[PDB]
Amino acid sequence: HHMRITVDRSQFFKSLGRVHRVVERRNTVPILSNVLIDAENGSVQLKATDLDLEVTESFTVNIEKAGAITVPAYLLYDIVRKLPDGSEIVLSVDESAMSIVSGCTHFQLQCLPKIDFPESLPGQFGCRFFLSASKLKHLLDCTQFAISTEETRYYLNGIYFHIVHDDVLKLRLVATDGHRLAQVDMEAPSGVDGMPGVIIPRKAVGELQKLLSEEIDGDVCIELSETKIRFSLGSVVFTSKLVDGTFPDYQRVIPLGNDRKLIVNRQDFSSAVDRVSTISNDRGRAVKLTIEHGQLKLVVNNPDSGSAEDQLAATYTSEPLEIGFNSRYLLDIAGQLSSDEMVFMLSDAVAPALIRDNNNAEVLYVLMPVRV
């Protein structure tokens, strides 16, 4: 079979945009730089993979001649980006090369056949349930920023997706890099009894988040085993290996007994930290908080540039405390919160801090101090 399809440029561009970013630019195995185009039975499916994560998107097209072909994905994307909105594109294979015709513009691209492209066996999943896309986005929004990117901590390079057998079952996501930790809970949907705790890889989280950022309607079908997880939403399917490791006993680090409470105006605190951290560099990003009754002072020292201080009103009635934090991590967590009021539950200067929006009960953050 030798494919021939006529597609709407804007539709094709949107679908290609969803799949092509899975391809690694640093990749050296030729077939893995390509997107598979598969046209059959009134539908075109685009597939890309890096062997750990696979993405497919499909759309309805009247097919002139069924067939399939794989095409270098970034090149195809860059070509379609430059073709005019509201135009049509004819993609066709002759008797491994693909023709692209749009108006008088005609490309002939060196391709590779579908048979070379990775195809998996059908997924076998022991657990299947649904979440709204908006809820899944909320869970990932609470936790993605805290994921480790350190190569020496591979089973921290993802999100621990697991059930908490409270009175009411909870579905929980935790991420940490050893300095920041994020924990979010929801009431568990039906169908997650017995669900294994799994580590969703950082890359899958990131690609899922890029799709979810478009504000997707409806539900996501989540399927998993102890080796793979699949997210189906709209016309898109993400299938990812799971991280093969055991996530740490993270409940040990969440300080539920901290007894010094600091409340600050979140925006005023964020802007002050942003200002004084301007002098920091690769040596570190420490900011010292000197906490007294009603008052917070911030100090940053960098031997290559100088010093920086600021002061804010605060609600604080406990024993005075001097405690240091990574200023970027403080801004990261302040950025997670939505309320005017940012609350720190503190202990001593080298004990983890518990941070949250003064309001909410489902999300918490933990941040380790640094010495100052």
Partner: peptide, 10 residues
């Protein structure tokens, strides 16, 4: 720059 007392990991 201590780590959280993660078990394992710190």
């Amino acid at each position: 720059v201590p780590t959280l007392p993660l078990v394992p990991x710190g």
